[model samples]
Target: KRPNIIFMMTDDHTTQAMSCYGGNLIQTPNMDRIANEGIRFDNCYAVNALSGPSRACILTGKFSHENGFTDNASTFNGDQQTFPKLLQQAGYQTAMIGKWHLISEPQGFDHWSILSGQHEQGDYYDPDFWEDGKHIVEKGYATDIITDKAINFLENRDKNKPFCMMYHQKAPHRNWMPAPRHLGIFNNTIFPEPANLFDDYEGRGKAAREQDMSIEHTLTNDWDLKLLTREEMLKDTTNRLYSVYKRMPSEVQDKWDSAYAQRIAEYRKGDLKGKALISWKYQQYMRDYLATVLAVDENIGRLLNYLEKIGELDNTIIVYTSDQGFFLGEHGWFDKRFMYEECQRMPLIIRYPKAIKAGSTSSAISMNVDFAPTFLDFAGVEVPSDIQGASLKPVLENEGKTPADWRKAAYYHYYEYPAEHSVKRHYGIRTQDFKLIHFYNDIDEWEMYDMKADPREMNNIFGKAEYAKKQKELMQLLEETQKQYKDNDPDEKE
Candidate 1:
């Protein structure tokens, strides 16, 4: 019998948060289990660092520009060819649950129950979910509820056919909220802050200095910190922040209040300002974010246990990844868009007893576009000629050995701007030891980082004379990569 595939993904989960990836923030035993028993990719990257575009690339095995979903502002064209549709045609039952932020009705699945409202970002408590083309509010934490729905799908799926289930989670996203039982899970812990938490963007271009995602400035009191009173929250004219608290029932509200009210009062008494305030914000952000991740890790154990009990664990291909990477106070920022290393690299782990070896690690450069072809290849189906990504079957089966002709560099492009965070439109190429980025649309500037020497990316050497030869080589390589990928930006064409 063909193996079933469960591709479990989370939103904005960075490698810095998973223990298997040497992350210091939290211990993710369930996520670690996948890496302990199978292969972990050290160079997995999202084609685009935004959710909608990244998911689109994963589905179609194409670049964001080629798929016409360039950024979060663009709606996904659901009628297009996707890997799930091909799997369905190949006699596989497919289902998707949780965090469908594509802004269009999902296609290419036998069934899909996605979170509704907030433009599909979904609320963390009492979230409204759309199932069978109707809206239903579920009363529980979003992570647990989504896992329940995924298990239900597994229980009721067709037994005669193989299954491909996309069990996605919305936890550990922005406005990070913990479940009731996890409200103060990290209260007794104090996390070690990143080295660049107070970065001033010195020696960098206008693009780095101008982004509006700083931990000190961008996060709000009501929305991010949950430190506002009901009357204080109502005073805001926008009324958009802290709406989740208003929606919570009194019992749930009491749990939250007991967890956070005293902490907020203590913070107010301290009256932290300047760098002190920024440091406090970073600590608070980690507390809530890690708590949410704890909930996600716990629910993953639940699903894995269920699979084992049903005797399907050994026959399933389990994959764990994130839509994109996020910043945890690196460069004093929150949110992902820049092609910086922290945001560019995503965590990828896959386990299959039949093919992948236990405790294996792969250093091959993998992109989100490769997901579709890999899935199709695993299903023993032919990949479409038009798909741009290559299958990773050989890499997995060979225990991380790359082919002699494997890709030498990965290309990246981000197009959303003047909308949120004010990150300029940029394109770049990341090779093994260096990164070359060109910021356009808002500024005509180039930046280069010798990642081998400066992995923090604090020093920009675009015009330095010592690297002239290496710079010329990278520029030509960037143009060649653009042409090869058919990106053909107007400036590049000229």
Candidate 2:
């Protein structure tokens, strides 16, 4: 029999932020339940480390070049074939209910209720939603509202047909605004800072030297740190902070202003600078970020309980992951666009009691492109030859043991350069022990890291004589993989 599918994903969610992935910062029991019951992929990556491109890769089972959405600026080519469309043909009812960042209409779902406005990223409170053709202004937290609509879809779906729902969320994104119930939830708790929080980008190329994502410089005081009153926000150049705040209920607005007022005053009175101010910013970032994630974990418990109540928990395939990994103060950076470990490494966990072993974990490297094929394989749908990724069934059914012929390395390419954050365009290959990257377009350079010796990637040893033999092998691998994946697009600049 065909299995039901629930793909739960969040925007810019980092691996180290979840307790299931050995995150010591917060306790995410509901997310941990999925990993404790099934399998977790340790080396999973997003082929492209941006939200829209990663989603396009997963939906089309292809890389950014093949999927035609290489960066956040590009619109999705909705006419292309997609996994949901294949599932629809195979008699599965499909729904997409949450963050849909691609700047095009979703083509392969029976129903979709996506967060709309501000480039389809939506607000944290009182979010506007697009349901089919009608625009519905919803009142409540985005995570809660998305979860509620997902349950409604399940209840209203046809009973005979198996279902596939892309249950996505908009939590923990930039301007991390927690739900009213969780406001200031982590105000007193101090998070452990990363050892390289003040990374100077030493031993790296001009790409790192010229980047604009540092916590001390790029993070704005008004929007990112929430150090503004209504009057200050109106006077500020960008009202990004006021946009979400103005959407709150009048009573909730009063509560929000009071709760955040103290922090705004601290920035003025304390006058912290250098490492001290960055440390304070890190604390604020984690506090707001983790509290936002708390709601996601709680709502997952809601969906899990509903499945159990329907007596279909064991038969359903539940997946929880992020579009890409985010930086929670790693290297003193916050956004993801680089091929570095923090942003390149995404979290992936799959739960299916009927077929997968409990508490299983895999070391095999997989990409975002593999998700669509894996769903198709479980639903007994034939994976098309044109799909660039392979099914993960062999490893899942074999107790997380990777097959001998499985992929040797995961390839990555990030193209959103000369834009926000100013991370240069780059492509690379990451094997178990070696990482070789090439940065181009306005800068040309090579960076290689010996993963076993330099896990933190603090040192770059690209042309070192000691790593010459390994660099040669990895260079061949990078070339072959690029040609194999058909990413030989001209490295042209706009």
Candidate 3:
């Protein structure tokens, strides 16, 4: 019998946030379950670290330029061959549920339900979901609602045919908001800070030092921060501070104005200012963000339990991954786009009892470009030779080591520019020991990081005297990677 496939994904989820990957703060129990029972890749990345393009890479097994999706706002031409549609052709029933951020409607899935892009960026309670052709406003937490739809799809699926389900979630994304049930979670706890949390941006070039997404810059007293009393917590408003003010009765407002309200009067004296005030806000932001992750992990557990109940747990292939890696106070930043390790490396854990051996690991440089072809290979279907990525079935079944002829390096290109977070557009190549990146169409500069010696990438050894020969070798490798991947337009294929 063909194995059922479940591709579970989250938005902006960093491997650095997973405990299995050395992240100490957040605990993702279910995500850990997959790693415990299957293959974990320590060096996996997204071809493009933005949403639409990365997803397009997953669907097509091609780079963003080849797939025709450059950024979030760009439209994906559905004419391109998608693996899901190809799987459907091979007699598998396919469906997609939850956050679909691609500009065009999903193609190739037999039945799909999606959330609007507006709701894709942290819509916690009572989300509007599109079911089939109808838009329905479902009441409840967005994560729970999406999970319910996924469970429903599994229940209603035809038992005779194999199934491919893409279950995507919007939680742990930007504007992180925990479910109401998870409010006050980690409120008093001092979450462990990252080792590079105060990265001085000493070695990075122009891009790393200039990002405007730090906790200090994003959260403010009136906007993201909320300090409300008990009576204020009962209101059904999204703005917790406004609810606190509204819940204050006229009599109480006057009475409170009398006692120690002179301390409140000190607000007019400009008492709380600068870094002191913003540090408190950062604490509150971490509390909310981690709480949201807690709820997401619970939902993952729920899905796993459902799978086990149906007796398909062992045979079914489950892939747990994220759209892209995120920066949790690394370099004091919050978003992903740059080709740095924190943002570039994605957490990829796959559990398939029949294929991948449990507790195995792979050191191969894999990326989103390999996703589509791998899925097709698992489904017993033919993948086109023209596809950009080679099948990873060998790595999965071989328990990490593969033949020497397999892909030795990974290529990456990110084109989103002058938009949210102002990340410069660039393209590069990553080998086991070095990375070469070139920022284009704007500041045309080259950056090389020696992963072997400076794993944190704290030094730009691109033009340094000691690493000159190594830099030349990496540049030649970069040229070869581009040519092999069909990205080298002007240069002839090697």
Candidate 4:
């Protein structure tokens, strides 16, 4: 019996913000609901810790190079084999309902309404939507509108056929725009900052030191902190999110102004400087980002409620995850694109009462690439031979127990560099107890960490004699895994 699949994905949503994933930052009850009822994956990682490439890997069940979408700059080849297309062949009614950031028209779905033409990130308020090739402007918060569209698709879905819906959320993305109702939700809250927020990168090499994602540097005053009025934002042409604020209805804009006024006033007072300013910015960042996340959590509840009400709740499979993890003030950073644990580890929760045990957890390594084959396995569809991901069915069905041949390590590769965040091109392997990364291309450096000893990855043990044995093991593993995955590193071509 094929079950309905609702693969709900969010952009830049990290494990650090979800309560089910040991997060103390915010209580994400709706996200927690799935984990409470089913299984929470503790070590699921992204093949590439960036939105577009991760989605490509998810859809194709392959790494970036094999999928031919190595970076955000490359457009996804929709003509290639995808899990959704395979599902369609297997008689599942499919829909792609939000945040299709692949820069190309989505294929294999019977219906799709995506956010694009805005660099594929969409606006937080009054977002632009492309619905089945028709362009339309939606009037509401992005989180609410996206959920509404997802529910609408479910309601109109063919009753005779099982459905597979990709319900993606654009909320809690960059600039962290909250819904009108969610503004100021965390204004009075003072969340604890990561101890390494002031990390000077002393123990690390060139890659860690040269990143441009620092909270004090990359986060803009107007777009991120809302320190400027609409008039003031308009005068400065470089405000990328100015269009978002401009498109908001006057009343919603008023709500944003009122909610953020206190912080803007505090900044205008000009008392904050140095560490004081950085601390203030962190608070503002947390407040806005967490408030935006609240909107997403509530919308997830709405989706869950709808599924339960339709009597398909227990019969359907719900997968809650993000395209990649993000840095929530970890290492003084606000973006992803790093191999660090904070940004590399994705939050995953699967709820399928028929196959998975409730309140269980899995430490087995899983990646975004595994999502495609896992869904295929659930649908009783045969996975294609070329797909690189292994089905996670055995793990989920066995109460989080893995088979003897299950992968012990997860591989990672990030190629978009000299680009947005200036994160260098790097590739590495992460085992349960160790992490080894090689920053190459424009620079050559290696970083290694004993994950069990230094979970924060503060100390780089590469080239240290004490870790020489472990370093050699990781290097051999990396070379073998790269060859197995057909990812021939450019540097090794010689």
Write out the backbone clash pairs for model 1: none
Total clashing pairs in model 1: 0
CA-lDDT, candidates in order: 0.89, 0.89, 0.78, 0.90
Candidate 2: residue 139 Cα off by (Å): 1.0
Q: Which segments of model 1 are wrong by more than 4 Å? A: 230-238, 490-494
**lDDT winner between candidates 1 and 4:** 4
TM-score, every prediction = 0.97, 0.98, 0.89, 0.98
- Estimate the overall C-alpha local distance difference test score of candidate 1: 0.89
Across 318-391, the per-residue lDDT of candidate 2 in tens digits comes to 99999999888888889898888888998888999778999999999999899989999999999999899989
lDDT of 3 by residue, 240-302 (tens): 444333333454434433422333334345666665555555566677677778877888899
Model 2 TM-score (2 dp): 0.98
List the candidates ranked by TM-score, beginning with the highest: 4, 2, 1, 3
Candidate 4, run of 10 with poorest lDDT? 485-494
Candidate 4 per-residue C-alpha lDDT over 92-168 given as tens digits, one digit per residue, 9 for 90 to 100: 99999889889999999999999974788888878888999999999888899999999999899899999999999
Give the per-residue lDDT of model 1 (tens digit) for 179-249: 88888777767889899999988979999899999999999887898786656666874665657876677
